[PDB]
Amino acid sequence: PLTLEGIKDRVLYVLKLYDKIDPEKLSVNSHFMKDLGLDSLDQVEIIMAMEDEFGFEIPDIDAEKLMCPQEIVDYIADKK
Amino acid sequence: KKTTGLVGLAVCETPHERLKILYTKILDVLGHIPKNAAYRKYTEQITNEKLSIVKAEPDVKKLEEQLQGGQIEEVILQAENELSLARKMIQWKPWEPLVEEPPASQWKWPI
Amino acid sequence: SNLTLNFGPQHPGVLRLVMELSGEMVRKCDPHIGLLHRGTEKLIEYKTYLQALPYFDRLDYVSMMCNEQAYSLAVEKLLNIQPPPRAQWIRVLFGEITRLLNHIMAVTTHALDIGAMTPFFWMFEEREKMFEFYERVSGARMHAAYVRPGGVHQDLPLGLMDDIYEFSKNFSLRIDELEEMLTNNRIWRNRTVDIGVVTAEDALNYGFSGVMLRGSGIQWDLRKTQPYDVYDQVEFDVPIGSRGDCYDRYLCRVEEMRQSIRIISQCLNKMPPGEIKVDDAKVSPPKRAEMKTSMESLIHHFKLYTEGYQVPPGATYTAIEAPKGEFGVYLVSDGSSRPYRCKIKAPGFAHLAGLDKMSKGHMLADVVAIIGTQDIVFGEVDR
Amino acid sequence: TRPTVRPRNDVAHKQLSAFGEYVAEILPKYVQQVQVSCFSELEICIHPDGVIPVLTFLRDHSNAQFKSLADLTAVDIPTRQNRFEIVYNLLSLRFNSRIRVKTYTDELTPVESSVSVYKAANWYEREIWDMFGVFFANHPDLRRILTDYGFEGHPFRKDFPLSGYVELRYDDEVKRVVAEPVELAQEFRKFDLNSPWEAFPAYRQPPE
Amino acid sequence: TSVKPIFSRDMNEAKRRVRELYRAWYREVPNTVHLFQLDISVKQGRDKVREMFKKNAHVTDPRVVDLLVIKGKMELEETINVWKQRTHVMRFFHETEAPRPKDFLSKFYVGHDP
Amino acid sequence: LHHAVIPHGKGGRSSVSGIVATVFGATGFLGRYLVNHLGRMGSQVIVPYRCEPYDTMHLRPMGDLGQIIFMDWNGRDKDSIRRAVEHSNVVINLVGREWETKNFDFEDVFVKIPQAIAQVSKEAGVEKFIHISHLNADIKSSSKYLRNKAVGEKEVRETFPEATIIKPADIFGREDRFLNYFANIRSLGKKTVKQPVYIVDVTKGIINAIKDPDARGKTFAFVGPNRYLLFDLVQYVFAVAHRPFLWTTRDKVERIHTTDRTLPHLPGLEDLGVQATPLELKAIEVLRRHRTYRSEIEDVQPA
Amino acid sequence: TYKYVNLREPSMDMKSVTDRAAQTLLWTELIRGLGMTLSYLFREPATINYPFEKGPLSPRFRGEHALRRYPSGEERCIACKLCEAVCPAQAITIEAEPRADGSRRTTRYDIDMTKCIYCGFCQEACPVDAIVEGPNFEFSTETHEELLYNKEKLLNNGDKWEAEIAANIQADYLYR
């Protein structure tokens, strides 16, 4: 049942489930670090939350080079 | 003799030839050391003197009490340790000149 | 996985031990020690020499005069003072008395830590007489300072050596009765023979000192190799262990008690009537009659107790054969009236370092026997 | 000079002088000061790049056994760039000799961690890490020995004060032991005891 | 000033190790707050963990950040073991301060306090 | 004020704050927490006790070295009470047992105890007398307890006019009466609004009222931030206590079935200035002792 | 000089091995240990009855120090602060004022018995022998307030006995 649009929707609802994101303002070119103004602390929080929900081990250099929700979805489609 | 005093040191059976092949290995690995260092001179001096003491002994207790180092198998462990540092001092190049000096206002004590 | 027990500070000394054991026969034990941490080194750094002498009296607490002797010989070694001969002989006599005390407490507390109850009571009656001797000599029950750097302070009163002679005879009979009671006692031999073997190579690399070196082969006595005092004039021999057993180490402690009896006998028979303290008013305080009817003695008393004597700058490390082993003190002194930094080598600390190799292939009652079989007081292990 | 003055020996002094010269000849790379004091104990003052070579040489080499290790400390000296002084205190068995290998370091430098060539240095190194603050690289375990877990500050420095910053007390609000800033009941009167008049002329440093 | 390092070469490995340690502290809190039977929700614990990481934010030297990583890893090992008790983990928090204010005026009514 | 009544430095543990508090009762629950916060302040607490010295031994190591002091008293003699308030900066009245005895009743504890102590503290010449009373203490019926506390409020308002009458709601804490009374049971289902308030907010309010004047004379009321129904409170405390389950006097059950109401004609916490806390945090704190091993936060919040 | 032990072999002579077997089977030495315990059973107990027989001591015992005073005269102290200078626990607190006569004296001489390690350095540092470590062990105090001795508890404690303290000093003033 694993389709890429379901991957994008599931990353979408777990980012909505994350509480500290203010406001929602979600897209594919969202770029939640500088367009939305959050710390790299929040970057590693989000990527380990992906790891906790449905991810692989997701090593920290690949975790650092994501920076974008559609690119998170595309990395999930890459490794799965 | 049988069951010397040290606990985890089980007794030997052939002291003479074992200690001789130990010191031939010492002189070999020391032969791979460079020449103008003092370390080759002092080690080769003391090891040739010790081996030359070993060369002419028919007995065991006479070699124990005559050659210093005391007990007979501690000499063998001591020889194995000196071979280990000879292998280690092929590396580390200690005969090179001094590594970079301290700020030189340091080793005076009374502050 | 495996059972990670947490032995807390209850009594089986006082520690915490986390043992990742396999199945009644262990795997990986770790002593968390430091629960009795006091701050002795920082406190001695902010105090003077004479004032911080009781810290060296009580950092180890079962031995009470050998630690004083080690610190006082550190200061007398750095300060270039030979003590007078009668001070040296009284220091030797009380070193042997404290050695007898520490070995007999180690024997009795190891017996009670296994579970045998009665020779504890017997030999503590004997140690009650030991403390009566300490009371009559100094005035304290246990923590007699009494050993100034500059010799023995305030010599023993008239009528003591006869009591020490009576105590020598009766104590020889009582230690013979202890060997009568235990020692070929079958269940105790079954309790401790093959537990805690120590190779002499590991005894040198793990830095074991004193009784562990006697038990594991190699002959090593500070009293025989490096005579730091008049030990070269008294004749005694040290016991050596053949096998690395705990039973062997028990036999070694009992025979060190017996050799302490010999040294006490010869020290009573060869006492010289020299003098109490040194012939220098600038280090030892002058006596009270000369203090009152003398000007310079009052000035030296006043300055020697306010400022204290100064120490020339330098660093030294001395170590003496305390009953636990090489009790070491490393003084570093800027030229001043306070020491700059002192540090203590504890034989109990060095012995507790090798607890892994002493309890790798045995069970947990044997772990309690290993903790007991080394005279570890957990106040000296802290530094 | 005969009564109550400690008689020094010159045989041990000459032998330790000759042996210190011999050690500094055979290890030219790491040796800076070779000093013998008046009471004949050897001290070798050492750059912190040769702790493993000097101690592997000194545990072996059969002309200086030095099997046993004692005190390790790194006496916390201000006024310098490199503060700490690590003192390996080596005791022989075949020889009855004592040498002190004193290497220097500052606050932020790994020395080469002698735990592999002296198994006694395990808790010594861990204790010096906890109390002073000198990190030791390529070392199995560094934890906090002789201190509380919630306590930090590396207290044996001269910069850490005598009384600590935290102080424990039980309270019934949260029904447990809590840490509060220190409110002493007495001052700890520091005495100004260091009198003038230069009690040793032989230790006068030359002035500017 | 060719200084020997601890672990790193510049601030890049420093940032990598501190984000690894923050990931470990993030996944290490709820186990401990279930284990030691504390009284504080998981979100407040995570907020004070990230506050402890935001406290040292002006540190720039790579050796210093390496040594702070070593400190945090030691304390995370001592908290993932059961060695530290309830007292020390509550001692990380501050419930018994009755905290002193920072305005000049209330520092003036309880004075001698610069 | 003489010297050694001026404050010095920081707070607590031989840090001299500027009040000397004579604290009546103080052996039970609320007095022990108030002595805890005064020992945290670093004051001098004169506690009188009529009981065994073992209970004041259990509350003993709170204050610092000789800060708190112990003395005996009775409910019969004015001389011991005047000896208790010989020299005191402040005095607080916290007394009253929730059940009758053979020597002291609900009658005249709340009439004969506060009149005597207020009379001798006015005649001794102290200021800032703080008296606690229960909320909804009215002349209207259904509790001897509550009508006696209403007579007590009127009498302590009549004599000593510059008093601080302060009234909390049904306070809950670590060693509570009514919430622990709920957990120790076996029950009925009705509707009654009731607002608990946590004890450390109440005693922070008391210490702010005791060291922060402009609040003298005015009576205060403590209102918790919840104000919800009793039935869902019982089901929430059973759900957090992990037990389903679907001295017990008649006065106690009528107190827990009295509808606690609030009037904003007297100011609450914000005009005094301390934050209030909701139920659930401290409820998960106090509700231990579930089962052998054994969140679902209800949060009814009616009206 | 070494005297090493644990060196015997099991003798294959029949008498030695049958004696070791008899030891193993017939329980010889365990009954021998029972005989030793019975030998201490039939002794007299080496106990003392405490509340009627207080135990023995020494004439230089240290504990419960108090201030002496002159024979038919004033206080013996000077407030010279030698004892405060030498006190290793730093327990002494001296504040000095002279009275109207002109002799230098005190106002405050406070000792914490809680901090006091009981050395004897304030016994031996005093030039006029004002403070002397007393004879006894009678503290057993219910409160932490009461173990902080003022000058007047010290003077009542030095006036509760001088005959004891003068007898101990007259016994032992020729050693120190």
Ligand SMILES: NC(=O)C1=CN([C@@H]2O[C@H](COP(=O)(O)OP(=O)(O)OC[C@H]3O[C@@H](n4cnc5c(N)ncnc54)[C@H](OP(=O)(O)O)[C@@H]3O)[C@@H](O)[C@H]2O)C=CC1
């Ligand atoms: N539900 C609650 O807890 C609420 C309580 N309050 C008030 O809080 C106060 C304390 O209540 P609480 O701690 O819960 O219960 P307690 O009954 O245990 O506290 C009362 C204190 O006064 C003492 N005391 C009571 N009656 C007498 C008497 N006749 N003679 C001498 N001493 C007496 C008590 O016992 P002892 O004699 O041993 O010292 C205790 O020290 C009361 O005045 C109550 O009205 C107010 C609102 C809510």
Ligand code: SF4
């Ligand atoms: S040393 Fe003696 S005279 Fe001096 S202050 Fe102390 S008690 Fe008084």
Ligand code: SF4
């Ligand atoms: S005996 Fe007590 S009061 Fe006297 S010097 Fe020692 S600690 Fe101070």
